[PDB]
Amino acid sequence: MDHRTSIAQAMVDRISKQMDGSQPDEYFNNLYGNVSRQTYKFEEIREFPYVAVHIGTETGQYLPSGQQWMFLELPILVYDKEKTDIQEQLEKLVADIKTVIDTGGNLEYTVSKPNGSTFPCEATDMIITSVSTDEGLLAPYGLAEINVTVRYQPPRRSL
Amino acid sequence: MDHRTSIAQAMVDRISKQMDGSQPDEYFNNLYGNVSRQTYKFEEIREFPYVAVHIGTETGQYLPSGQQWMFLELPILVYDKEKTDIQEQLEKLVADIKTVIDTGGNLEYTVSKPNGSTFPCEATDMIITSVSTDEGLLAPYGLAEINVTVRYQPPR
Amino acid sequence: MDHRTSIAQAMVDRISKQMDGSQPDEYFNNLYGNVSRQTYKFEEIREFPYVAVHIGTETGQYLPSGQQWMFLELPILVYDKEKTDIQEQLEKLVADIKTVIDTGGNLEYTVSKPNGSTFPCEATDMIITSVSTDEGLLAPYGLAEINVTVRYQPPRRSL
Amino acid sequence: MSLQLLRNTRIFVSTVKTGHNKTNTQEILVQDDISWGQDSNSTDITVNEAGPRPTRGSKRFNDSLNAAEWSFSTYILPYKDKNTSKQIVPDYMLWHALSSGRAINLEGTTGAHNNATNFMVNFKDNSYHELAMLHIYILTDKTWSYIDSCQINQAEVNVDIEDIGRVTWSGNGNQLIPLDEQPFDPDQIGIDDETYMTIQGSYIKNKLTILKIKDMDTNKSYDIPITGGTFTINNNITYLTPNVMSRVTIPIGSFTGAFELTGSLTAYLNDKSLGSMELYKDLIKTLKVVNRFEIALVLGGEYDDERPAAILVAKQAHVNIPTIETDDVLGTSVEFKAIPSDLDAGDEGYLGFSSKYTRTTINNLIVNGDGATDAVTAITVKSAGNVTTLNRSATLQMSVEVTPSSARNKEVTWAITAGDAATINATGLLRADASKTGAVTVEATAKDGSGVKGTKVITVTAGG
Amino acid sequence: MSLQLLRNTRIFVSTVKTGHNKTNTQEILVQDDISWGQDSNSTDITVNEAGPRPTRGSKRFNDSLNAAEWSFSTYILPYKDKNTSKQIVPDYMLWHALSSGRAINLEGTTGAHNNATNFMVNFKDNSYHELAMLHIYILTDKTWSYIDSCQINQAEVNVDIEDIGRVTWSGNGNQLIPLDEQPFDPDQIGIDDETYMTIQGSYIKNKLTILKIKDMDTNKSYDIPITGGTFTINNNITYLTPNVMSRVTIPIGSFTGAFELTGSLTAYLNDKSLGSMELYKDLIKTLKVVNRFEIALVLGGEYDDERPAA
């Protein structure tokens, strides 16, 4: 029982959905849905601002009554150009993504059982470890790595 | 609601405002506002003394009532030439930066909002955890590192 | 509020002052004031025995009443030639420097306020971490790195 | 040949010993903090005399057997059951046993009873010598064992721990009896995958925890941001055991002690108005013998979105003298105990559990006791015929509009606060008299304790 | 809206409550081991009867209030004052309070009297029911609070800790009263940068610490090199509080106990003559009921050069 890519797809869809002009007083930017679950290379990326959602290691734990706490890391990377300056635009994007990640309810995704039914579910909690900007990169191209651990629980097994 | 660049701009603005000719007794030199958090190539550095504010990693921990503790690390670099004696000049700059960081009130930074609601907020902690300088560089050129790890609680 | 270079200059002046022939029964060697606060390179040095006083990092600690315990490292390096042997001469120099560092009072340095007044001051204490000889160097040229942390306190600030 | 692992331990709770089904037995999910057992006493005799070559020896004897002890921690999981569409929690039998001694009845108004909006446990109707009688069945790998009959002694909820909310249960029992045969099919009684999927998303996060606190005597509301705290329900269970010497004994009956809804709080020191400084200064300066505080610790916070939340309410709770601490950032600690109005009334406090809590629902639970029942949020007065002025010796029976329109307390009290120009009664027929050349202010208070006011000043003069 | 940090806390000690100046109020420098507060008692009543459906409930009551408590550590800083050129220490008011109950008088011969050479504290003239009455004023960032009246109960000096010499004060008080307005200008009363610069170099290091020990009956002196030790002055203070039941009470008066200048030492066993072996063997062999030893712990060591020492 794993929900890695499902959680990542839910994260991408949530970021895309809660960034349009419907909430100008809640969020700064507007990605127009330029959120993808994978990036080939930074050289391949053609549009800015652009955000990629990576998949990290996936730790598991065990509980006496058959439960299983299972942690997943979600390193999120963003890119932007020097329309005005790297610092202000990158900070705006990072704070806006933080507002997306901290407000609202839980991460809702779709779990597809092998039988042929997709049951919507909800993740437990979201916590950010650290945010970092990659200085020393190209002069007009920036980076702001924000590290996140989505903690979810699979359907009960190991009976 | 991170305001890390806001904190860096508050650092730069406070450094530019203080350590000027208005209070020549409490400070050694005059930068003439030669402060900018935006870094440049070392060969591109126009005149000395020059100060650059680097923003590094930024950790955080949570609290039960929606409170958030966010530790921002702000490495600071000062470059200056051996006009008279390079070791003494960097000494003076480091002492002045320490005085600016320690004395006075807490940091004043302006937090902006999407609907143009800009209001001022202040941080709590200002500690220079360590100070180190690099030697073996080009004889006229110098560099010193001052590590401030500003600790701030973001609004809400 | 920093006194790196002032402390290093005071250390150099103390070493140069307390090694002449005035105290033959207290000290072995005599550098004739061949003590400098910086060395460009080992190959540049022309006279032996020669001692350089490097400047290390600067740790800082804060106290409730506005005080500030703030530390400084003083790696001291010495050089000598094979007049008799590396071991005995380097040991004599290191033991001499240790006797200088452990006896007497404190470090008296000169602190120059921006107004134009230089008030003599005194450092708090001195502790040796370790002394090390750099074996494997050139056959007639030796080295003996002695590490020192000078602990001192700046004028009261951070009110 | 097989070794029993803790990772494969399942604890089942039942209110009966035979004829098990899904309505009397239920599986609950525990954490690594699981313990059980039963320790024994032992008397030892020895001789002593002054003769040479003494008799060095002893003979141990078992005399009695202490009551068994068990303890485990479970997450708080308020969810909705598709069978009845009523909010329940997996460990509701434990809540009922800790709250009341009568038989389990989820549709009532006492004990642990659920509503279509929230599952709330009422500590009223707890005046019994023994609580609900549960038998704890423990499955570990393959061997079956159980505790004969348990009465929960304590329940701890802690918000200082950064993980999701947990409740720490602790009780006692008569005897830990090992079992030789399986009492019931584990899968049929235990929770299915559907319930696990439905409750997997109803965890309560302690990262988002608020508190409402208010002194009744001074009518001051405080904004304290919590950094930690806890509240513990204690029944003070004391066991009884015959002490006959010939044979080993077993405890027979348990006597309840004193109900204790004790809790504690801590927060940073914030100079802002009505902050922790205001509470600290008021409590220390006033130095009253007893206080009447209305604390409300809300796990999961209150948001306009429908989100799960666990609520503790402690009406008229006593608050001790705050003690200031000293560390990197100054913080104070407030400890409170929820005393009742009357020693036998049993209105010390009540809890609330739901998955679709809202700000309005939480507020009407705080001021009404239940989530479903509404509560007045604003009140304005209106005169009979919309007249804002009056003369001497005139009758104006004003009325009041209530908000929201579904509030249960549609009646209020009529009072006069400022000015002496007219008098009113409970009915509302306001009348004035002669020699009145001044205005008066009429005020009202909701009978449900919400505390909403409707203000109006009528310019009563000598007339035309 | 502001949060109070411990890093910005300043402790002021004064012997009066009004008309403050620089001769009655003085600022002292504390360490991270700072604590204060005032805990409260509580009586709890309950009922018990054998009837069915018993009355389960209780009602807490406050009955009295314990005496306040505070404790902080400060460095030993003997320096000279340019006003009078007499040796003093920043925390001399605390020494006077711990040593005597009479009024403060630096030019006398009892209590805490200083000289042109040294500042000495004499425990003679301490036979009083209460010591000097001080009010501790605590500033934390922007909020002012203070303890009504404190009497120093203990002082510990530890040489085992490798850092420079420190004294650990500890006392009690009548009540911890929060304050609404600033009593005095903090900078005028507090120490200036000149005094800080003058005393920054007068620290006492425990790396150099010697001891003189001698038995008067035998007239034999021992060369004992210390590896650790401490001495503690304790006044054994005890507070009196009425126990009226109707209203919450406050302690009114304190009674001094028994003066106790207890200390301890430790050293390696050295076979050298008149070493620790001689002391060990003599003390074990004689097994006298009471000994008359003249110990002298000298923090900072003694040298021909003019160097600070306690």
Residue numbers in the entry:
A (entry chain A), C (entry chain C): 1 to 159
B (entry chain B): 1 to 156
D (entry chain G): 1 to 464
E (entry chain H): 1 to 310
Paper quotes:
Using electron cryo-microscopy (cryo-EM) and single particle analysis, we determined the organization of the tail proximal extremity of siphophage T5 that possesses a long flexible tail and solved the structure of its tail terminator protein p142 (TrP142). In siphophages, functional tails are produced after capping of the tail tube by the tail terminator proteins (TrP), of which siphophage λ gpU is the prototype. TrPp142 is resolved as a hexameric ring, interacting with the last tail tube protein TTPpb6 ring. TrPp142 is a 161-residues protein, mainly formed by a four-strand antiparallel β-sheet that lines the lumen of the tube, flanked by two α-helices, and a short loop between β-strands 1 and 2.
